[PDB]
Amino acid sequence: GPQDNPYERGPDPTEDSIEAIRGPFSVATERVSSFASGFGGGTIYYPRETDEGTFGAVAVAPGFTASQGSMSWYGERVASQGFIVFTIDTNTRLDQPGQRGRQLLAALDYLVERSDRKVRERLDPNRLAVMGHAMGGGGSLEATVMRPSLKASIPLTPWNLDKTWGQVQVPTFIIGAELDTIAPVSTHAKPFYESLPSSLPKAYMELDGATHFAPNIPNTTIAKYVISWLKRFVDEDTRYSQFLCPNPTDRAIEEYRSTCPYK
């Protein structure tokens, strides 16, 4: 309840509520032409309802390789659970994970500093997160080392040649795709997960039979645990602990690793 946590939003969850295509909040959008010079723009998704309090925010980065598939589906799916979601446009000029990390941070800076007042009136600037696909997932990792005050990080089929992440202090949930040949889990996702501190709240979820572009298509297994991770760490909402610990065992999941329980 709200008494023990002022950041709780929405009714008490179930497996069904985390799997829902839309949560309890209706969602509005705001296009942004540019959030920083050189970095391009994106789309902000925000809950319309203000009567439960302000919300944390997640910036969402795409990958590098050409694909008309996108990150847009995360926008309303996640925002409708009570979050501000800023999907960042593709940018072929940013060809390194560190650049995508800086892009993620610039997007968050914009949200906090000078986004439309409708968004800022709904925003808790102290509770921010990053998520990204592929090189953008590498960027999520990079962003957390650059900004350890972030509340959560979700690298989706992440790609990064830097394999060492022992300095990450932000709760990190890595999603891998079994059949990924672009960011293979054996040399990307798994070494990232294993290098994160043993005392970090962390998880690794691998999707059975999934290709590299699985995160670009609506996927309930991804969504339900992304939602649960953001709830648990951006909102400190322990009502969502039930879905994260003990480890998920959904049929769609190849393997799950975690540092449960999350104190």
Ligand X SMILES: CCOC(=O)CCC(=O)O
208 binds, among Zn ion, ligand X, none (CB under 5 to 8 A by kind): Zn ion
Q: Is the CB of 71 or the CB of 119 nearer to ligand X? A: 71
- 162 annotated as a binding-site residue: yes
> How many CB atoms are closer than 10 A to CB 76?
19
In one-letter notation, the amino acid at residue 18 is: I
Of 148-187, binders to ligand X (CB under 6 A) are 159, 182-183
Does residue 108 belong to the site contacting ligand X (CB under 6 A)?
no
> How many CB atoms are closer than 10 A to CB 156?
31
Q: Is the CB of 59 or the CB of 234 nearer to ligand X? A: 59
Does residue 135 belong to the site contacting ligand X (CB under 6 A)?
yes
The beta strands (E) that lie in the chain are given as 27-36, 40-47, 55-61, 84-88, 123-133, 152-156, 172-177, 202-207, 253-258
Q: Is the CB of 181 or the CB of 199 nearer to ligand X? A: 181
The span from the first CA to the last CA of the chain, in angstroms, equals 19
Which residues bind to Zn ion, rule: CB under 5 A?
1, 4-5, 15, 162, 164, 178, 208, 254
65 binds, among Zn ion, ligand X, none (CB under 5 to 8 A by kind): ligand X
Would you state the structure tokens that stand for residue 116, as one six-digit string? 């439309």
Q: Is the CB of 70 or the CB of 242 nearer to Zn ion? A: 242
Output phi, psi for 221, to 5 deg.
Answer: -65, -45
Among 65, 169, 220, 259, binds ligand X (CB under 6 A): 65
- 178 annotated as a binding-site residue: yes
Listing DSSP states for 14-47 in one string gives -HHHHH-SS-SS-EEEEEEEEEETTTEEEEEEEE
CA distances to 6, 138, 143, 224 from 202, rounded to whole Å, are: 24, 16, 16, 16
- 116 annotated as a binding-site residue: no
In one-letter notation, the amino acid at residue 120 is: R
Cα 42 from Cα 80, distance rounded (Å): 18
Among 63, 75, 82, 171, binds ligand X (CB under 6 A): 63
Per DSSP, the three-state class of 177 is: strand
Cα 185 from Cα 182, distance rounded (Å): 9
4 binds, among ligand X, Zn ion, none (CB under 5 to 8 A by kind): Zn ion
Applying CB under 6 A, the span of 1-9, 57-65, 83-91, 229-237 interacting with ligand X comes to 57-65
Does residue 233 belong to the site contacting ligand X (CB under 6 A)?
no
Question: Minimal distance in Å, beta carbon 95 to ligand X?
Answer: 7
Q: Is the CB of 123 or the CB of 154 nearer to ligand X? A: 154
Q: Is the CB of 107 or the CB of 134 nearer to ligand X? A: 134
Total interface residues for ligand X by CB under 6 A: 8
Q: Which residues are annotated as a binding site for Zn(2+)?
A: 4, 8, 15, 51-52, 76, 142, 162, 164, 178, 206, 208, 254-255
Give the footprint of ligand X on this chain (CB under 6 A): 63-65, 134-135, 159, 182-183
